[PDB]
Design a protein around this motif. Structure first.
Motif, PDB file in Angstrom:
ATOM      1  N   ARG C  16     -16.774 -13.439   5.178  1.00  0.00           N
ATOM      2  CA  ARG C  16     -17.881 -13.954   4.433  1.00  0.00           C
ATOM      3  C   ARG C  16     -17.276 -13.798   2.812  1.00  0.00           C
ATOM      4  NH1 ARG C  16     -23.614 -13.562   7.275  1.00  0.00           N
ATOM      5  NH2 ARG C  16     -23.624 -14.519   8.699  1.00  0.00           N
ATOM      6  N   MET C  17     -16.881 -12.332   2.517  1.00  0.00           N
ATOM      7  CA  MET C  17     -16.151 -11.981   0.933  1.00  0.00           C
ATOM      8  C   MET C  17     -14.260 -12.155   1.181  1.00  0.00           C
ATOM      9  SD  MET C  17     -17.504  -7.501   0.649  1.00  0.00           S
ATOM     10  CE  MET C  17     -19.346  -7.694   0.333  1.00  0.00           C
ATOM     11  N   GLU C  18     -13.909 -13.002   2.035  1.00  0.00           N
ATOM     12  CA  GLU C  18     -12.797 -13.477   2.083  1.00  0.00           C
ATOM     13  C   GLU C  18     -12.763 -14.807   0.929  1.00  0.00           C
ATOM     14  OE1 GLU C  18     -10.908 -10.407   2.455  1.00  0.00           O
ATOM     15  OE2 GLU C  18      -9.767 -12.040   2.445  1.00  0.00           O
ATOM     16  N   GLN C  19     -13.854 -15.422   2.225  1.00  0.00           N
ATOM     17  CA  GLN C  19     -14.180 -17.149   1.442  1.00  0.00           C
ATOM     18  C   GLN C  19     -15.102 -17.111   0.075  1.00  0.00           C
ATOM     19  OE1 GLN C  19     -15.575 -20.022   4.456  1.00  0.00           O
ATOM     20  NE2 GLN C  19     -16.416 -17.890   5.608  1.00  0.00           N
ATOM     21  N   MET C  20     -14.526 -15.485  -0.606  1.00  0.00           N
ATOM     22  CA  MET C  20     -15.022 -16.300  -2.170  1.00  0.00           C
ATOM     23  C   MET C  20     -14.381 -16.147  -3.037  1.00  0.00           C
ATOM     24  SD  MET C  20     -18.068 -12.987  -4.050  1.00  0.00           S
ATOM     25  CE  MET C  20     -17.077 -11.750  -3.357  1.00  0.00           C
ATOM     26  N   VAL C  21     -12.895 -16.151  -2.653  1.00  0.00           N
ATOM     27  CA  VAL C  21     -12.150 -16.708  -2.961  1.00  0.00           C
ATOM     28  C   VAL C  21     -11.432 -16.325  -4.580  1.00  0.00           C
ATOM     29  CG1 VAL C  21     -11.060 -18.413  -1.694  1.00  0.00           C
ATOM     30  CG2 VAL C  21     -12.664 -19.189  -3.797  1.00  0.00           C
ATOM     31  N   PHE C  22     -11.246 -14.575  -4.613  1.00  0.00           N
ATOM     32  CA  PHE C  22     -10.463 -13.602  -5.861  1.00  0.00           C
ATOM     33  C   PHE C  22      -8.870 -13.633  -5.817  1.00  0.00           C
ATOM     34  CE2 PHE C  22     -10.228  -9.187  -7.717  1.00  0.00           C
ATOM     35  CZ  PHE C  22     -11.733 -10.650  -8.658  1.00  0.00           C
ATOM     36  N   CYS C  23      -8.870 -13.314  -6.912  1.00  0.00           N
ATOM     37  CA  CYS C  23      -7.707 -13.359  -7.250  1.00  0.00           C
ATOM     38  C   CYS C  23      -7.578 -11.457  -8.433  1.00  0.00           C
ATOM     39  CB  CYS C  23      -7.085 -14.047  -7.989  1.00  0.00           C
ATOM     40  SG  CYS C  23      -5.432 -14.050  -8.509  1.00  0.00           S
ATOM     41  N   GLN C  24      -6.794 -10.816  -7.945  1.00  0.00           N
ATOM     42  CA  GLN C  24      -6.187  -9.604  -8.111  1.00  0.00           C
ATOM     43  C   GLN C  24      -5.401  -9.547  -9.523  1.00  0.00           C
ATOM     44  OE1 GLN C  24      -5.785 -10.164  -4.294  1.00  0.00           O
ATOM     45  NE2 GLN C  24      -3.945 -10.899  -5.435  1.00  0.00           N
ATOM     46  N   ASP C  25      -5.367  -8.664  -9.806  1.00  0.00           N
ATOM     47  CA  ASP C  25      -4.147  -8.398 -11.228  1.00  0.00           C
ATOM     48  C   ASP C  25      -2.819  -8.687 -10.605  1.00  0.00           C
ATOM     49  OD1 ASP C  25      -5.395  -7.305 -14.345  1.00  0.00           O
ATOM     50  OD2 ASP C  25      -6.746  -8.048 -12.525  1.00  0.00           O
ATOM     51  N   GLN C  26      -3.059  -7.761  -9.599  1.00  0.00           N
ATOM     52  CA  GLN C  26      -1.374  -8.572  -8.626  1.00  0.00           C
ATOM     53  C   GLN C  26      -0.887  -8.964  -7.624  1.00  0.00           C
ATOM     54  OE1 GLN C  26      -1.451  -4.823 -11.261  1.00  0.00           O
ATOM     55  NE2 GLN C  26       0.367  -5.576  -9.891  1.00  0.00           N
ATOM     56  N   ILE C  27      -1.183 -10.363  -7.976  1.00  0.00           N
ATOM     57  CA  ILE C  27      -0.915 -11.683  -8.004  1.00  0.00           C
ATOM     58  C   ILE C  27       0.728 -12.487  -8.500  1.00  0.00           C
ATOM     59  CG2 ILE C  27      -1.255 -13.614  -9.363  1.00  0.00           C
ATOM     60  CD1 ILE C  27      -1.765 -14.494  -6.075  1.00  0.00           C
ATOM     61  N   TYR C  28       1.272 -11.705  -9.821  1.00  0.00           N
ATOM     62  CA  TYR C  28       2.434 -11.903  -9.707  1.00  0.00           C
ATOM     63  C   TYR C  28       3.584 -11.122  -9.030  1.00  0.00           C
ATOM     64  CZ  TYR C  28       6.040 -10.198 -13.944  1.00  0.00           C
ATOM     65  OH  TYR C  28       7.292  -9.326 -14.085  1.00  0.00           O
ATOM     66  N   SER C  29       3.659  -9.910  -7.769  1.00  0.00           N
ATOM     67  CA  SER C  29       4.341  -9.970  -6.911  1.00  0.00           C
ATOM     68  C   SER C  29       4.200 -11.423  -6.301  1.00  0.00           C
ATOM     69  CB  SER C  29       3.917  -8.332  -7.154  1.00  0.00           C
ATOM     70  OG  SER C  29       3.406  -7.450  -7.470  1.00  0.00           O
ATOM     71  N   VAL C  30       3.369 -11.731  -5.535  1.00  0.00           N
ATOM     72  CA  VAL C  30       3.888 -12.502  -4.664  1.00  0.00           C
ATOM     73  C   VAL C  30       3.885 -14.530  -5.388  1.00  0.00           C
ATOM     74  CG1 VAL C  30       2.282 -11.356  -2.542  1.00  0.00           C
ATOM     75  CG2 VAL C  30       1.425 -13.683  -3.780  1.00  0.00           C
ATOM     76  N   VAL C  31       3.729 -14.454  -6.568  1.00  0.00           N
ATOM     77  CA  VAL C  31       4.081 -15.545  -7.667  1.00  0.00           C
ATOM     78  C   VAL C  31       5.764 -15.137  -7.121  1.00  0.00           C
ATOM     79  CG1 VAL C  31       4.301 -17.060  -9.157  1.00  0.00           C
ATOM     80  CG2 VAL C  31       2.061 -16.533  -7.857  1.00  0.00           C
ATOM     81  N   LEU C  32       6.247 -14.540  -7.864  1.00  0.00           N
ATOM     82  CA  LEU C  32       7.583 -14.050  -7.670  1.00  0.00           C
ATOM     83  C   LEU C  32       8.931 -14.074  -6.772  1.00  0.00           C
ATOM     84  CD1 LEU C  32       9.797 -13.648 -10.838  1.00  0.00           C
ATOM     85  CD2 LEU C  32       9.538 -11.396  -9.688  1.00  0.00           C
ATOM     86  N   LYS C  33       7.361 -13.541  -5.550  1.00  0.00           N
ATOM     87  CA  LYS C  33       8.129 -13.479  -4.090  1.00  0.00           C
ATOM     88  C   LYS C  33       8.249 -14.954  -3.631  1.00  0.00           C
ATOM     89  CE  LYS C  33       9.606 -10.928  -0.816  1.00  0.00           C
ATOM     90  NZ  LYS C  33      10.945 -10.526  -0.767  1.00  0.00           N
ATOM     91  N   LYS C  34       7.604 -15.257  -3.783  1.00  0.00           N
ATOM     92  CA  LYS C  34       7.756 -16.789  -3.232  1.00  0.00           C
ATOM     93  C   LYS C  34       8.506 -17.825  -4.646  1.00  0.00           C
ATOM     94  CE  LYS C  34       5.253 -21.206  -4.901  1.00  0.00           C
ATOM     95  NZ  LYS C  34       6.477 -21.823  -5.886  1.00  0.00           N
ATOM     96  N   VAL C  35       8.819 -18.381  -5.329  1.00  0.00           N
ATOM     97  CA  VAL C  35       9.880 -18.230  -6.870  1.00  0.00           C
ATOM     98  C   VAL C  35      11.039 -18.467  -6.157  1.00  0.00           C
ATOM     99  CG1 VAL C  35      11.266 -18.333  -9.018  1.00  0.00           C
ATOM    100  CG2 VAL C  35       8.560 -18.481  -8.709  1.00  0.00           C
ATOM    101  N   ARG C  36      11.517 -16.418  -5.817  1.00  0.00           N
ATOM    102  CA  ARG C  36      13.048 -16.231  -4.332  1.00  0.00           C
ATOM    103  C   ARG C  36      13.364 -17.493  -3.531  1.00  0.00           C
ATOM    104  NH1 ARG C  36      16.958 -13.298  -7.143  1.00  0.00           N
ATOM    105  NH2 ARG C  36      18.038 -13.201  -5.067  1.00  0.00           N
ATOM    106  N   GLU C  37      12.492 -17.251  -2.676  1.00  0.00           N
ATOM    107  CA  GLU C  37      11.977 -18.036  -1.511  1.00  0.00           C
ATOM    108  C   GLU C  37      12.608 -19.577  -1.569  1.00  0.00           C
ATOM    109  OE1 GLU C  37       9.364 -17.320   1.884  1.00  0.00           O
ATOM    110  OE2 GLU C  37       8.876 -15.049   1.410  1.00  0.00           O
ATOM    111  N   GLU C  38      11.860 -19.815  -2.362  1.00  0.00           N
ATOM    112  CA  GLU C  38      12.136 -21.186  -3.539  1.00  0.00           C
ATOM    113  C   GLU C  38      13.564 -21.568  -4.034  1.00  0.00           C
ATOM    114  OE1 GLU C  38       7.647 -23.721  -4.575  1.00  0.00           O
ATOM    115  OE2 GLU C  38       8.649 -21.937  -6.058  1.00  0.00           O
ATOM    116  N   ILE C  39      14.178 -21.022  -4.303  1.00  0.00           N
ATOM    117  CA  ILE C  39      15.693 -21.450  -5.801  1.00  0.00           C
ATOM    118  C   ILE C  39      16.506 -20.058  -5.410  1.00  0.00           C
ATOM    119  CG2 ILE C  39      15.945 -21.570  -8.066  1.00  0.00           C
ATOM    120  CD1 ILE C  39      13.158 -22.458  -8.517  1.00  0.00           C
ATOM    121  N   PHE C  40      16.407 -19.069  -5.888  1.00  0.00           N
ATOM    122  CA  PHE C  40      17.474 -18.292  -5.662  1.00  0.00           C
ATOM    123  C   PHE C  40      18.474 -17.728  -4.949  1.00  0.00           C
ATOM    124  CE2 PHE C  40      14.967 -17.336 -10.448  1.00  0.00           C
ATOM    125  CZ  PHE C  40      15.981 -17.813 -10.853  1.00  0.00           C
ATOM    126  N   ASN C  41      17.356 -17.880  -3.687  1.00  0.00           N
ATOM    127  CA  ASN C  41      18.485 -16.942  -1.941  1.00  0.00           C
ATOM    128  C   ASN C  41      18.881 -18.286  -1.493  1.00  0.00           C
ATOM    129  OD1 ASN C  41      16.893 -14.809  -2.529  1.00  0.00           O
ATOM    130  ND2 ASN C  41      15.002 -15.023  -1.260  1.00  0.00           N
TER     131      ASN C  41
END
Lengths: 52, 52, 131, 51, 51, 80, 51
Positions: C16-41
């Motif tokens: 019921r907590m998970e549905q409330m759709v929060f976003c930690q400071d530590q979102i940078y690491s996965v957005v960066l990770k995603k960019v690597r799977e998209e382009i550079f790799n």
């Protein structure tokens, strides 16, 4: 023959300490268990000196 | 106060005999424990297998 | 049953907590990770952004769900049980009743004590002879 | 939301501070729980007391 | 030493001499018994009393 | 105050889970990773293991406190 | 001396045949004695049984 002759005295002294470490601990247990029974405490500790 | 105090505990000779060997098994369980190293250590002290 | 019930309602509350759709400071690491799977790799703009959020939700759920069952059904259950034992022993009356036992095993007990006492006697005799 | 950027700065600060406590005072537990945790190897109860 | 401990028990008159009575601590074990037996029956009256 | 109780109580429960240690197959990646930053690039071994398990704790504590604080004080509160 | 050298070859050789006994030991270890005995790591008493 000289190298091995020098080790004889401090190995013997280390055996003396290590005996003083073991007997005092076994005596700790003799004291916890049998502090309520006087004949048994005097029987068991004499047994510990015998065996040691 | 009850845990710290012992004796008699039976006063009749057939059930006294089982009581001594039951207490002897308490004694021997703590020597086997202590040999391996695994006693109920008092605060701020150090294990017998650590000192050897 | 009681902890099984607490845990049912704690499992709704965590999701019921998970549905409330929060976003930690530590979102940078996965957005960066995603960019690597998209382009550079489109679908990739939200759905790979989404798979990225999904990885951090794989970690939280990977912990809290086993943590709820250990906390309630292993630990508190047990401590609850050991504590509740003390209330039974309040009733003076039941102590005679609790300690009822079958007649055969009451009978065997006496015999077994007698027979031990007898053979340690004979042992001692044998040992006295060869002194 | 502004006071949950701050929270994640506290998580590191105590991580840094407990890290210093560990090498200074692990020694007392180690020499006292030694044979309980089977002449270590990595000692499970001593680790559990840090957590 | 564990082997040695069973050798004590090879004389059959010795049980009584070995487990001699204290008698002071052994006496007071019977008053500790009586008192907790009373503390428990008392407790069971407060337990009925609080409906 | 009905909802202040509800978060106060829940935050404290969150802690007593924390002290039970588990990490199943998730722990793998951190404890592979410390070998490349430390050794490649005992009290020491005890230390690094505590620092590894602090990282993934630090992952859930950065989320889990906010979620509890937000849920009882905002989401279910505006409904109540 | 030719058999003392043969004895040396024995000792080394028996390091490659005890790979069979430790891979069936680890199987018991993993669904029993490692999580039975407090979540190892390398547990001393497990390491004693194979030595």
């Amino acid at each position: 023959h000289q190298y091995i002759q020098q080790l004889v005295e401090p190995a013997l002294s280390m055996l003396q300490k290590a005996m003083e470490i073991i007997q005092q601990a076994f005596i700790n247990v003799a004291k916890k268990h049998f502090g309520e029974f006087f004949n048994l405490n005097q029987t068991v500790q004499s047994t510990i000196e015998d065996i040691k | 106060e009850l845990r710290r105090c012992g004796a008699d505990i039976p006063s009749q000779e057939a059930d006294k005999m089982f009581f001594l060997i039951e207490k002897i098994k308490m004694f021997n369980q703590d020597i086997e424990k202590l040999v391996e190293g695994e006693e109920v250590v008092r605060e701020n002290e150090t294990r017998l297998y650590n000192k050897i | 049953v009681k902890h099984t019930a607490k845990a049912e309602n704690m499992i709704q509350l965590q999701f019921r907590m998970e549905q409330m759709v929060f976003c930690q400071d530590q979102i940078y690491s996965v957005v960066l990770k995603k960019v690597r799977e998209e382009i550079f790799n489109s679908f990739t703009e939200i759905g790979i952004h989404l798979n990225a959020y999904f990885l951090e939700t794989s970690k939280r759920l990977a912990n809290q769900i086993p943590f709820i069952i250990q906390y309630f059904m292993l630990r508190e259950n047990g401590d609850s049980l050991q504590k509740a034992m003390m209330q039974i022993l309040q009733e003076k009356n039941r102590y005679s009743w609790l300690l009822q036992e079958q007649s055969e095993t009451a009978t065997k007990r006496r015999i077994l004590k007698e027979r031990i006492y007898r053979l340690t006697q004979a042992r001692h005799a044998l040992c006295q002879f060869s002194s | 939301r502004e006071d949950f950027k701050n929270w994640v700065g506290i998580l590191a600060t105590n991580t840094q501070k407990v890290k210093n406590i560990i090498h200074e005072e692990v020694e007392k537990y180690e020499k006292q729980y030694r044979g309980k945790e089977l002449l270590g190897f990595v000692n499970y109860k001593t680790f559990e007391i840090i957590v």
